Amino acid sequence: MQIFVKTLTGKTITLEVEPSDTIENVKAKIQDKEGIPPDQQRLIFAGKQLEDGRTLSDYNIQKESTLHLVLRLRGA
Amino acid sequence: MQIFVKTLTGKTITLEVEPSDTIENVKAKIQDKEGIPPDQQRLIFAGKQLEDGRTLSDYNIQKESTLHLVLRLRGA
Amino acid sequence: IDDALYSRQRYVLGDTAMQKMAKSHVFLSGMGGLGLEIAKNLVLAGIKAVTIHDTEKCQAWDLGTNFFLSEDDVVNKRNRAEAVLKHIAELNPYVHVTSSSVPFNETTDLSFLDKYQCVVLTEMKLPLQKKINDFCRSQCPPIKFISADVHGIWSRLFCDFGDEFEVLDTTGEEPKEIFISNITQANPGIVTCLENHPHKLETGQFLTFREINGMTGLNGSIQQITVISPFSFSIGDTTELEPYLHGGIAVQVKTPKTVFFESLERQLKHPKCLIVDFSNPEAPLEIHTAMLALDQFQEKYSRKPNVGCQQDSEELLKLATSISETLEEKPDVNADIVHWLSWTAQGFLSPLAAAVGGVASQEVLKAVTGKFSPLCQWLYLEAADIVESLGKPECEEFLPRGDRYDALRACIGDTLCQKLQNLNIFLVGCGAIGCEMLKNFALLGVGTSKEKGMITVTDPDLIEKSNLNRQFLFRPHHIQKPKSYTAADATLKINSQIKIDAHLNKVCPTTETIYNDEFYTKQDVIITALDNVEARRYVDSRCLANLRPLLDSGTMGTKGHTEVIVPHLTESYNSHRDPPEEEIPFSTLKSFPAAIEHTIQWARDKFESSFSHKPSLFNKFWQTYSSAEEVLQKIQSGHSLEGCFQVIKLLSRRPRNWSQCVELARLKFEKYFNHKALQLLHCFPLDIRLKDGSLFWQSPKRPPSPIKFDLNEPLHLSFLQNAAKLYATVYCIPFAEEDLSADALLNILSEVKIQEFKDERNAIFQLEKAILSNEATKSDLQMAVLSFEKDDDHNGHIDFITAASNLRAKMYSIEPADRFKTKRIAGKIIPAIATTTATVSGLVALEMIKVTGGYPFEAYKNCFLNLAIPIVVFTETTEVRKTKIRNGISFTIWDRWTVHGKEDFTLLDFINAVKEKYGIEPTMVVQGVKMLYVPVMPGHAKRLKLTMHKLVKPTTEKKYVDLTVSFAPDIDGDEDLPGPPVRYYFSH
Amino acid sequence: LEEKYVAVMKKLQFDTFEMVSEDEDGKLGFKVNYHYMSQVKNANDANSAARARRLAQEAVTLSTSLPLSSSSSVFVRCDEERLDIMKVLITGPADTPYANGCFEFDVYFPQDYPSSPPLVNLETTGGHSVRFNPNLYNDGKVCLSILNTWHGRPEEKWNPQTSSFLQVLVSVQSLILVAEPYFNEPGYERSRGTPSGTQSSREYDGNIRQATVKWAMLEQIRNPSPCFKEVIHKHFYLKRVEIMAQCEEWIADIQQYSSDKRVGRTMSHHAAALKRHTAQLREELLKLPCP
Ligand SMILES: O=P(O)(O)O[C@H]1[C@H](OP(=O)(O)O)[C@@H](OP(=O)(O)O)[C@H](OP(=O)(O)O)[C@@H](OP(=O)(O)O)[C@H]1OP(=O)(O)O
């Protein structure tokens, strides 16, 4: 199933994944599609900073909600 | 094709370009080695200032050609 | 070294340069314009001993070439060397100057010349010059040989430093510092630079290394490098060393360079020239051939060619043809060069002389110090473009008329001089550039026509001790006087016909009222001497509003640039961007310094906040509220007050005497230099690690360290004295200088304890305590508000700032800085030298002639220079750019649309008029920074039915205003198309 | 309930207010406290024109794109004659230590805009007495990568063509306000889940909670700013009961760690401060009239 996710440039990514997509598999897939390292990929949604191990359905929320990201916090 | 960019203060920069490249891409290549933004740099060849939107073939730039990088000063 | 007169020079050169140029002897021959200007330049440099020489006498023709001669000198027929020795002696008391008139010929003994170390020759016959070069070069050590000559619009320059010359610094650019990320124990070793920050280096350069973990053997060693990638390179074998752990700093190491020269005679057969215009690289060889042919003709006929004498022209052409084949390269012959040289062989041109003199003085500096790379080995400057646009002028216009301007008429003719005498030029700024501006203009006799021709200068600045180093127009008895008035008084001596207006105004939008557009249109050309880009942009926008020619230049140190703008031909000054100083996050500045400049900036900001912001806030607070009991009641009633906590804390901590201020300084030192490190280490232990396990306190961060106080440390005592005196000055507490003695301060601190390291009610309690102590008097709510002064030696600003910066470096294990560098960085002082400014002044004065000529777009040039190489370039200026919008409508930067309206004229009327006249509807209207109609913001829709006189609220003195308009993009969601400037008149 | 909250307040997201009055001499008379006196008064160059077009385009987006929700909402006021004088207030996100807060900012547009990122500062600093978030300096300094420029990483910095004001608003409202700002400091996320890190997080969160209870509500209501006055009166009026409920939950949670010894005394001090704040806060809410 596909998804909506937006970024700094606002790309609303829409790509098919699995219902048990573990967030480490999500990091792998993100580095497949873009090659960006998972260390910058601190995915956040529904008030939860995503931890790798559990699957997509392990959180009980499902697809199509526009998700977004936070960087590793660099200081001012 | 090989070209040289000699800035004032004697620093020499080596560049790889091909005819048909656009002046703006040629100057953006400078940033990868110097950090100077494209909008901040003026480059001169054969007594003419290279205008944006043109290509190297228009100015007849060939192998081992030399381009100068110049800046304005503030003191007085 | 008296810093008050050589502060800029020290930063330009360095102490070794001043030490070497001391105890130096230079011989110069020929009291022409070139000799005079080189002499003034070197005296401004400040050589201990210089000897001049000349055997000729004053002439009426010498008036147009010498700016220190007088009509009395010509009347008395004095030797040219004697009549100027006094004036040049006035420049520097520390410079000893000697004059000589010993006859020189083939039989003259040259053994006496060994006393000097360098020789400068001008207006000398060629074979004698060759003989002198041979004698000088045969010496052990050889004496530097320098020669230059000028004929009309032609200049020749040659240099010879012997078989081998040594350079102690090729470029003069400070080496950079990097951070080591990874190193491989490989043969050859591979070094990985930190993330980003490409090294920008080159293969073969040497770097020294330090604080490398694992390979302690690589610390203190110098390795020649081999660039591999933008962020990596190669070093020697490292397999025999320990594994790399972390850290490492590499800095480039400069290397002395040896160069070589040749004899004059050998170089004549194949000169090693330097190219300044890549458009015609073949020109210098032809010019050298023409100069050699001219020398041959002059030797043969003992005379210069006559203007209009075609036989002289063909004879010179035949001589050049004979010479050209003889050359090693065997070049061709440029007939027009020969014709023009023969036509104007007897003229003299001032700005070319000035530029040649500046570059020659710089090369003499290179010879005496070896601090820069010398020029090798030839130079030829020329300004033929001015005479190229003349078509075919007659020789009669060049004929002399028996005046001081005979040479200039022989150069360009009488007509251009007549056009020159009628120019109304405006000058802004009166720095070092403005003085030589005025000197050159006096030499040109600009504006001397009674009916027309005017010069205006405005500068609010006064005369300062350091200004005399660069500004020769001013004397030590002129200190604290308007620059404009003193400069005008100095310049009017040379020529009585000068019509000059001098003002103390600073150009700015507020003063624009005196500078109305009628005044601008009255002027014909404007020259800039500004030091800041904001005023430059403002002046650009002013001149563009009048379509007026403008000239701009700028110099730092050994670099300089010149720019020319012409109405309807080129782009604006604002058409290009300038790189501002980069920003530093406090994440660095406040907490994680990595360089001495960071500590300098932090100390400067702390000083500013403490001694400027805080007293002003306190006084504003206590002038807003008259009574302190009133404030106490308002606090007790729960009312909020702005900045109340800070002011009450300051007042409760108000010292009353000298000892209290001393204790305050001591505790401030304790807090600043001891407790901060403790708190930072408490929040972050030295062993704290990151997610990867890498140390948080890794590069570029440096761990701090608390410092224990010691009065016996001179730095600590100096900083304490600075802090105490600043506190006493701020709090209006008088004191005696004997209190600053170390013994008295020790007596004060011998009973001083220090607290160890670890709201509204307390503030109210302190306020009540102050009230019951009668500490709320009107005098108590006051302290002096201070301003930074880097030019005062006793105020202690620099002393305190340097001490604080050194300490802040110290606890972070950073190398401190001396007083001079700290002062230069804090004041952001711009180094400069007389040679560069003189050369750029000559260049801009020369280009002014082309500006006057009304020549086509191809005649003008812009030049950028860096004599440290040395390097000079001449390029054609940017052409004007076209901007189309829609429906085939296009415009330029010079185009301006105009619409006349009425008193009942409305916004819909304006839209209808503009759309009718130009076919496009203005989608928005804004007057400068205040909007007039934006449909997005609610309520601007009702603005369409308003009187435009009402909506604008203009000033009566102006009958028109200029507004900004835009137009809807063809595709919605895109940025609106910008509109050309529109000038609206309130009435016809 | 939340439907009514969003419905009523949608008309007040974007609006305008008059702050500067110019006399006959051109002097700038500011009617309210603004952090940028000197910059506005001194920088009088009108050479910039592209900034006007850029802000005209921005006004279209910012008039409709303002986030508005029960958790957090955006409301902005700007000068009715100038363009570089900004003011904005945000409502604290639900369940955060800054829950249902109200904080003000002052934003100045430089002349060289959009070639440079604008300026911004806090306004509810408590007289600079409170440092709220690692990314929030107590004096009021605001630091954002999209609002600054250095060597660093190219895409993150201020991009004149792509970086937008609304993006800055979103970055602030989202990244600055998080559930656990204690681990915002890099190097502390190494100790996530550890009992010591958890205890330190609890203590820091209690500190933040008591500080925001003191300043973000009581001080705001007692001496409101003229600009966002009616807006805050309406917003705080509706959320009184939930504010009381979360205050009681916080106080009950604060009481749980008073038995500790490592953090017990400071924890109880935070409890006492919170109770003292709530004592007057309840009275103030009971005195609040219906808008
Ligand atoms: O007002 P500033 O010039 O910005 O300096 C202040 C000031 O220090 P000084 O009085 O020594 O100049 C604060 O002290 P108070 O007068 O407010 O008590 C101090 O706060 P602390 O005493 O609580 O340490 C603060 O430091 P910080 O912001 O780290 O708390 C420090 O700021 P700077 O030293 O960075 O200017």
Ligand SMILES: *P(=O)(O)OC[C@H]1O[C@@H](n2cnc3c(N)ncnc32)[C@H](O)[C@@H]1O
């Ligand atoms: P350099 O710094 O040697 O000399 C510059 C001089 O120009 C004057 N100046 C600076 N800025 C202005 C403006 N805006 N208007 C008029 N004059 C200006 C400085 O005072 C120096 O004298």
